[model samples]
Target: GSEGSEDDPLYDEAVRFVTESRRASISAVQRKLKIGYNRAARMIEAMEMAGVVTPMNTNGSREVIAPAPVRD
Candidate 1:
C-alpha cells in the first residue's frame, strides 16, 4: 500500500467492483464507484497481485477477467 492510505477504505470495494465486472473501463469504474483514478488503479493492481483478475492486454490496463477459486 505505498500509494494507498487508511483513509481510503473504499479501495477494497473498488477492487471488488473491478474483479466482478465484465469489460470495465477506468472511467466507468470512476463513475460507478465515484472514486478517483489513483484509487481505482491501485485496487486493480492489488487484485492482480491476489490473482483475482487478469488483463486481456500486455499493457495490463484492460478488462479484468474473473479468476477461478483456489484449489485446496
Candidate 2:
C-alpha cells in the first residue's frame, strides 16, 4: 500500500483545520486530531507533499499554502 494517499481519510480535515486556524504546525494537528506525534508529523508531511501546506519553516511550523475546498 502507498505510505500516504491523496485519498487519505484525514487529508481534508487536516487541511480545513489548518486553513481555518491559519496555524500549520505538527502540534496543532496533534491537538486538534487527538493524534500522536508521529501521525501528526506524517499528516503534515502528506499535506506538504500534496501542496495543502507549505514546506517546513525554521521554527518547526508551516503555512497554509493552499486554500481549503469549499463545502456545499
Best by lDDT: 2
lDDT of each: 0.59, 0.71
lDDT of 1: 0.59
As a TM-score, model 1 comes out at: 0.57
Model 2 TM-score on a 0 to 1 scale? 0.74
lDDT of 2 by residue, 1-72 (tens): 243335556656666778787767878887897776676677677778778788767886678877755784
Root-mean-square deviation of Cα positions for candidate 2 versus the true structure, in angstroms: 2.4
Which numbered prediction scores highest in TM-score against the true structure?
2
Off by over 4 Å in 1: 2-8, 58-61, 65-72
Error of 1 at 21 (Å): 1.9
How many clashing pairs per prediction, in order?
A: 0, 0
lDDT per residue, candidate 1, 1-72, as tens digits?
864332247655655566566544566567778888876666656555655456647664566555523452
**Candidate 2 Cα errors over 4 Å, as ranges:** 1-4, 69-72
TM-score, one value per model:
0.57, 0.74
